[PDB]
Structures are given as C-alpha cells and as structure tokens.
Design a protein around this ligand. Sequence first.
Ligand SMILES: [Mg+2]
Ligand SMILES: [Mg+2]
Ligand SMILES: [Mg+2]
Ligand SMILES: [Mg+2]
Ligand SMILES: [Mg+2]
Ligand SMILES: [Mg+2]
Ligand SMILES: [Mg+2]
Lengths: 217, 120, 36, 140, 62, 50, 137, 155
Amino acid sequence: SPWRLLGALCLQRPPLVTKPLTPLQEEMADLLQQIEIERSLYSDHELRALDEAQQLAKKKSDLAQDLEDMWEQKFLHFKLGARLTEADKKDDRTSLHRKLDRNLILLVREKLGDQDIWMLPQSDWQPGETLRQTAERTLATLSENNMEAKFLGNAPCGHYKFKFLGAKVFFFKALLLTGDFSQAGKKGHHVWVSKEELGDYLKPKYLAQVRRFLLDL
Amino acid sequence: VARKERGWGTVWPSREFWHRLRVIRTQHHIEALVEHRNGQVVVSASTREWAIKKHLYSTRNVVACESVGRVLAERCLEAGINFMVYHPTPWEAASDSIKRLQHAMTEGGVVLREPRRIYE
Amino acid sequence: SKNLGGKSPGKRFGIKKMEGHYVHAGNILATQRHFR
Amino acid sequence: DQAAKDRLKKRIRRLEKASQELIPIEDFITPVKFLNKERQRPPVELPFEESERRALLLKRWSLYKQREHEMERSAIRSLLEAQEEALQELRLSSPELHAEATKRDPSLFPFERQGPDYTPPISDYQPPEGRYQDITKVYT
Amino acid sequence: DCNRALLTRLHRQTYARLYPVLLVKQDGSTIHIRYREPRRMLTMPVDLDSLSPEERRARFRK
Amino acid sequence: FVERVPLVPKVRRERKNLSDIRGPSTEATEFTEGRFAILALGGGYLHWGH
Amino acid sequence: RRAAPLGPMPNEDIDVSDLERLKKYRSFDRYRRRAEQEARKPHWWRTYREHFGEESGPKDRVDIGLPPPKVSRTQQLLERKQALRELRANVEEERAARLQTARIPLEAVRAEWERTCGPYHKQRLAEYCGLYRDLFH
Amino acid sequence: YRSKPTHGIGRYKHLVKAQVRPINLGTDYEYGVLNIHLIAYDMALAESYAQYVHNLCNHLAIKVEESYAMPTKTMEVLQLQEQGSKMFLDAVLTTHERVVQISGLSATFAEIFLEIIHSNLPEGVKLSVREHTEEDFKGRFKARPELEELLAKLN
RNA sequence: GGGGUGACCUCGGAGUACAAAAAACCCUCCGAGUGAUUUUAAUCUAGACAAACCAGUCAAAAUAACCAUAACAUCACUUA
Ligand SMILES: [Mg+2]
Ligand SMILES: [Mg+2]
Ligand SMILES: [Mg+2]
Ligand SMILES: [Mg+2]
Ligand SMILES: [Mg+2]
Ligand SMILES: [Mg+2]
Ligand SMILES: [Mg+2]
C-alpha cells in the first residue's frame, strides 16, 4: 500500500480590536464601576474641587472645573481611528484589515486537473524534510511575500487521511506577527475569513472539520 | 445518673454525652441528626425529605437551615428529648445559618448543654 | 573527660495494665513521654 | 598586595553569606496619603430596589460565568481530543516524525505577546514630541 | 473571549478614585486605563526611538 | 581517584560496629553494566592504601 | 519478628511516590467526613464498636407488619419535579429567601412527614427505646 | 506492636513531605519551569488576568510553582510644550507586572495553553512566556552596591 | 585500669540498651543551676505510678468564685 504525506499551514491573524460587550456585561461593568466609586476613599481631583467649592462659598460671604472643561474640549477635538473598516467597503474580502474584532484565517483557491477544491494551503515534502520546516517553506514560497509567522508547537494540530493507495494531510497552526503582502492585485485568490464564512465556503468533509481544532471565540 | 462517656480529650469532638446534635451541610441539602452515644440516629430532619422539600425553596440557604432547625426542635419535643450537646467547629459556630439554627432549636424548647451527671 | 551528664535513671515510661486486666477507678493504665 | 586581597575576598564572602530579601512592592502597601480622606467620605444609602436589582444581576452573572467556563472547557476538550487523534495517527503512520514532533522547538523561549486595543492604529499618525524618565525608587 | 478577565475592580480597602482614561501610544491605538486625575485622554510621546540623524530630521521638519 | 578523608570529616566518633563485616553482603551483589568483577569471598575493611 | 496483615491495610491503596500530583483535601470538614465514613466500616482489627456493643453487628430483623404502599415511582418523581419547578418559578419566594424572612407551615410539614416517612422514624425510635426488644425480642 | 499484624497502622509520614533544569528526552519533552509575565498599566486588570491564568492552570492540573508580583515601574511623561524649548510634566504611568511560575508542560499542551491565553488576552496587557533563569530570579531582589564596588576594586 | 598530675562528683534528652521495665564504664553527643507573659493557677479526698528509705508523680467525686459549656498557668526539644 503506497502512502503519500502532505503538510498544511493554518495561519491565524488575531483580532486587532476588542469585541463589543453583551448587555449583561455592560450592566456588570456599570455595577462594578458604581461599587468601586462607592468603596473608594477619595481622589485628589474631587478633593481639591470640593475644597475650592467650599472656600469660595465661605469667602463670598466673608480651577478643577476649568481643568475638567479643558480636558473635555481636548477629548472632543481629538478624533480616534474608525473601528469599522469593513462596513464602508463591503466589497474587499481579501484584505488583511477586513475584520478587527475576530481572528481570521487564509484560504487559497486552486483548480487542479481532476479536482476544483477551495483548499487550505498545503505542501509536499521529501522524507528528508521536517513538517515544521515544510510549513515554513510553504509560507515562504507560496505566499509570495515577506510575512512573519509565529509557530506555536512542533506537534501537528490536525490529521486527515483519505484512501483511493492512501494519502495523509497534517495541519499545523501558526500565528501571524506582521504581514507585508506584496502584489495584492494578483489572480491568486487568497481570502481572509472568520469561522462563519469558513463554514459557508468550505465544501469538503475533510476540510469541514477544521472547526474541530480551530477556536470559535 | 447514667454513665456518660468521659474520656478521649485528645480527639474531637468529645463523646461525653447522651444525645448529640450533628449538622451536615452538603452543597445541596442540610441534614440535622440527633445521635445517641452508640452512633444510631434517634431523630433526624433532612431537606431531602419531601415535607420540607416541597414547602421550601433553595434547601441550602440560611432560611432552610433555620427551617430544618425548627422542624428538628419540634420532632425532638415530640420524641421526648429535651437535652443534647452541639460541638461545632470554630468556623461553623460563627456562621449565620448555624447561629439561626441554634436559636430556632432553643426557641422550640430543645435546650443544649446536657445536664451534669449525678455522682459523675 | 569531655562527655558529662550522660548519667540519668530511666523514668519507667511504659504500659502498666495490659488488655484484659480488670482495673478500678484511678488506676494508671500507662505512662508515656510522648503520645504513644 | 596579598593581605589586601585577603581582606577583599573575606569581605566578599561575608557579603555573600548575607540575606537576599526582595523589593517591597508599592502596590500591596498603602501610602500615608490615604489616612486623611477616610473621615470625609460620605456613605451611599443604597436603596432597596437597587439592592434587589444588584442581587439579581449577581445571580445572572454567576450563571453566565458558569456557562462561559463550561463552553470554554468544552472547546479545550475538543482541541485536546483532536490533538490526541492527530498524535496517534502520526504514531501509527511513522515513528520518526512522531519522535521529532513530540519535542519543543528552540524558537519558543522568548514568547512575547500583546493584546488587542480599543481602536485600530491610525495610519500616518505622529506623536508630537516628548521625553521619558523613570522615577522609580531604589532599595538596598 | 477578550472580555473574559476584564470585568473586575480594585479588590483593596484603602484606595483613591480611578477614572477610565483613554491612553493613546505612538501607534494610533487607544486603551482604557484606570487612572486618577480624570483627564479624558492621555498621549504617549517619543523622543528616543531613532538615532541622531532621524532626530535632526524630525527637528528640521517640525 | 578516591579521597582518603571525605570532604566533610565525621567529627563525632562512632563505635566499631563489626556487623558491617559479619554476615553476607546484601548490596552490590549483582552486575550493573560490566561483564567482569572482583568478588569478595570474605569480610574486611578497605582503606586508602587498598 | 514481623507478621502479615490479616486483610487490607488502611492507607495502602494510594501511591506513596509522586505525592504532588495527588489531590488533597484542604478542609478539616472534608477530612472529618472521610474519617467518620471510614470508622463505620467493619475492620479486621480490634475496634471500638466490637468492644462497646454494636449489638451483634448486622441482624436480620423479622418484619411482622403491613407491606409498604405500592406507589408509581415515575409518576411520583414527575409530580414532585413539577411542584418544585412551580415553586421555583415564583419571585416572592426568592425575595423572601434572599431577605432571610420566610416561615414554614410546620403543621403541613408534620402531616406530610407522618404520611410519607413518619412510620420509619417511629420504627427507629421504638427500636432505640427498646419496644421491639421487649415485645417480640 | 512490631510483631503484631496491625503494625504500622499509624504510619503517616510517607503520605506528606514537609522537611529545576529542563528534562528533555526527545519524546517526553517536559522542560523546566516557565515564567508567564503579564504587564499592564492597569493594576486591576493585571491582577485580574493573573488570577484568571492561575485558576486556569489549577484547573488544567499544571503545577504552579509560584504566583508573585514584580516591583512597579513608575515612568514620568514629559511632553514638549507648544512653541518648543520646554518639557512639562503631563502625567505618571505606574506599570505593574504579575508573574505566574509553572513547573511542567509538554509540547502539545503548551501549544494549547498559549492558544487559550492569547485568545483570552484582554486589552492593554503584554504577555511574555519565558524560561525562569538567573537574571529573572535576581530581578526581584535588591541592589548589591558593596558587592559591585568590591568587584570593581578587585578588577 | 597503682597512686600523683589531669578530669569528674548533682539533674534532664538521644545512642550503648533494635520490641514491657531496669541496666555500667575516666563510653559517644546535647544541655540545666532559668528567662518571658498573664489565664496568679484553692481546699478536701477514692484509687493508682514509681521507689531500699528519704523523696518524687498522677488523679475521679465533693466543696467557694468566675462562662452559668474550661480553669492541667503557657512558651523556650519541657524533659532538667
Ligand atoms: Mg541515659
Ligand atoms: Mg543509672
Ligand atoms: Mg422518587
Ligand atoms: Mg594497670
Ligand atoms: Mg587535681
Ligand atoms: Mg510497682
Ligand atoms: Mg472534679
């Protein structure tokens, strides 16, 4: 029985922004802030504010507000970065900056001679190579860019076999540090994707189980 | 005038009594037993009993502990036992549920601190 | 010479009454240095 | 020449035989600045409706935290069983790759990691100017 | 799962009042920090990252 | 090389227990990694000269 | 001289080596429960009950009485679960339990007690007071 | 008694003991102890994540060597006032660090653990999983003024 | 292990003296000739340990005052 071996790379880009809070978490945050303010002793700002409000009240018969107004005007003048960068495009599904609240993974489109599969980045290696080094060379030559990836461990994350004579594919997970993807207007269809759109796109049964070892978040 | 079991002194709790109150507070139910010196349970009140389970919600809380204390006090008055000892841990004696259980048992007529043996 | 004071009688620490002995109130059952 | 070296090594050994007590942490100790505002803080006078809604919120939060812990542990168990299946498949296929994969890579010692932010970084942003300095205490 | 260990408070008895200040580093991103002196935002500057050449370049461009 | 006196000398003087010579040996009676050895058919003392 | 134990030793089952990976009880109450559960087992050595009258240990008591009432355990558990769910669905009971201000219908409790489990408590109380020992022996 | 079958029934000192280099064998790579540092400007958030990772290790049965805190680093912000040629005080940032020291971990379980930590990482916290070395041990100690002066006058 | 010189002379702990008790040497080692604190810790009496004697040790019940539920003063290897 002949055996074929293949490694595969699953690159995760982590979320750059925090997810919004569930209303339960918002109520909990309000309650926690309230009880923290209650159990608090005193702040120097409110202490000097009350000191001034008392001394002026007793002096008219015989500032902290300015600093607060200055800080409020500075906060109103300063504009923060837009947390939403996808609701304005709604067209670009291959950009690295697509989603910021969730973690994304990369899918490549490949049309072989006998199979047309929306397949995760795979590779081939001779018995003289390691699986981690195989995935490294894969991300080096196939992606066609200088991106820095952080490998978690040497042990494989997923294993999938199929017999025709058999073949095995071992999926290794990797984390993205920074990606400088050059030649973005190419024909090579690479897409950054979250879990729901993975479940939407991935047709095959061997690749529909990536959600088993991929975190849901 | 019966012979109490004086003795151990090194182990806890002391076995010098005729009847002994034992409160077991599990994570679900509360069980208050009145055992004899031989170990047999004379009269018991448990939150696992249907009579208190159907009449009480949250069979673990302080309300349930006080309830089982009242029921045990009534059952002890019925059985004719008026004196028993209670030897709780230093952290169980300062709790809120056990304090209310002791208060309810005392108000129900069952008084702790078994009488001294005549000619001990 | 150098080693002094090693002379001391035994304190008779032992078990006085064995199992089955009929004793009376106040009879010392056993004496001990540590809790045996 | 030699007596000086003797005294030097002696003082070295004496200082080495000393204790190695740690730095007191300024977080766990309360400064003296917090001893004059405790009498000026007024109470809260929490009302009954707020107390009841706080108790209900605490019970809901306990339930939600329990459910979150359960789902997180379920995901951990799924990942762990997938890892065990992969390792068993590797052991069945070839022992050499399993042996060289069951070890730790030499690139994992300086593992650095940073969490998310409240807003994504702004392109072409410039901090105006300013220098930094450390005013942390010293101890001997 | 980023909001797992976020919903907490100060678990000490004697402490001053802290406020949710928005701190922006030299990247364009902001974070929420518990800090006294309730300034609605704090800015992190930089003058020691690059060398003397880029320092003089920035000084001339400013 | 074996040292004549251990790195920490025993300051307290001990009795000469001859039971450590009397009787059969219980330790170091089987081979560990080699194939030949010197077997002792009697009891005695080995000092730095030996 | 050494003798072999006439049965299993008490602490011979847990592994002596690698004690750090073994779970410990950090609660005096946990240890007390474990000890009181282990003390009620019929050990092969001289114990306290054997000398101070366990009353011949286990005894096959002859039952001279009416059979227990044959009830449907499944329907009983179903209606009990339904009653408990109905009791927990309320909000005033929860408010009372939280405020620690709740009373108990002691009369109904006693009625249900003598209806379902009162007979067994009375039986054990009579066994303690020695009624059967002097009436049927 | 010694000759009785109940000998050693009170034997208890073997049940409790009351009186780290990396172990790499290729397959059972149970390396030495590891230090997980969580650094943040928010003391409350740092303590919260320290408690969270400690409880996670306790649930995952990872032997936690220690759970301590490093000395706070207080930086002073000096901003350039407008029109140049000045440096005025803006605020002070107190940066805290909580370190959990765990003993043993395998490659697979370590990968899963880093996965979980980096997935549950809150905002504004630096996570650093390093090996416990001599400099990491000496960082939470005091100044050796006399000792370094002695080394200087010796050299 | 002749006297002289030297050393020791009383009390307690460990080994000698492996498991009831006892057991010597100018045998091997630790110590004591009291400190600190407050709960300032009584009278009377069964029955016992130990012991040549002198001495040393425990102690139920009953009595007066404090909780109306303890009082053996505690710690320093507590034994001296
Ligand atoms: Mg002696
Ligand atoms: Mg003698
Ligand atoms: Mg049933
Ligand atoms: Mg002679
Ligand atoms: Mg002389
Ligand atoms: Mg005698
Ligand atoms: Mg008395």
